[PDB]
Amino acid sequence: AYFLDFDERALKEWRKLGSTVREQLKKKLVEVLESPRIEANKLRGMPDCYKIKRLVYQVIDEKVVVFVISVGKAERSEVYSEAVKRIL
């Protein structure tokens, strides 16, 4: 029941996550559109910001729009890469 919208920086971020991710995220996002305000996912101190497991979105009631603002990863890309190397 909520419209989707992406911040342009986040859409650019989205186009670099890879094939596998931006699909499982697309799934969880469209699910969020039904009822965006999930208490278990609300960022601390932030009245309108929520997380998807990361992805962050802003709920804009005045427009009924879910605004995806930030999407990325827990660590730097180098940390996962170095972790893969470290175990070889």
Author numbering: 2 to 54, 61 to 95
Question: What does the primary publication say about this deposited structure?
Answer:
Two additional crystal structures of isolated RelE further show that the C-terminal helix uses this motif to adopt multiple, defined conformations. To better assess the structural rearrangements that take place in RelE upon RelB binding, we determined the structures of isolated RelE present in the two crystal forms obtained for the isolated toxin (P21 and P212121). In the structure of the P212121 crystal form, which has two molecules in the ASU, RelE also forms a domain-swap dimer involving the C-terminal helix; however, this interaction is not symmetrical. The interaction patterns observed between helix α3 and the core domain are identical in the RelE monomer, symmetrical dimer, and one molecule of the asymmetrical dimer, whereas they differ in the other molecule. The most common interaction is characterized by a strong salt bridge between Arg93 and Glu14 in addition to multiple contacts between hydrophobic residues such as Val86 and Tyr87 (left). In the alternative conformation observed in the asymmetrical dimer, the helix is pulled farther back and Arg93 now makes a hydrophobic interaction by stacking its guanidinium group on Phe74 (middle).
The bacterial relBE locus encodes a toxin-antitoxin complex in which the toxin, RelE, is capable of cleaving mRNA in the ribosomal A site cotranslationally. The antitoxin, RelB, both binds and inhibits RelE, and regulates transcription through operator binding and conditional cooperativity controlled by RelE. Binding of RelB inhibits RelE by displacement of the C-terminal, flexible α-helix, which contains a tyrosine residue (Tyr87) that is critical for catalysis (Li et al., 2009). RelB is additionally known to dimerize through formation of a ribbon-helix-helix (RHH) DNA binding motif that allows transcriptional autoregulation through binding to the relO operator region (Li et al., 2008; Overgaard et al., 2009).
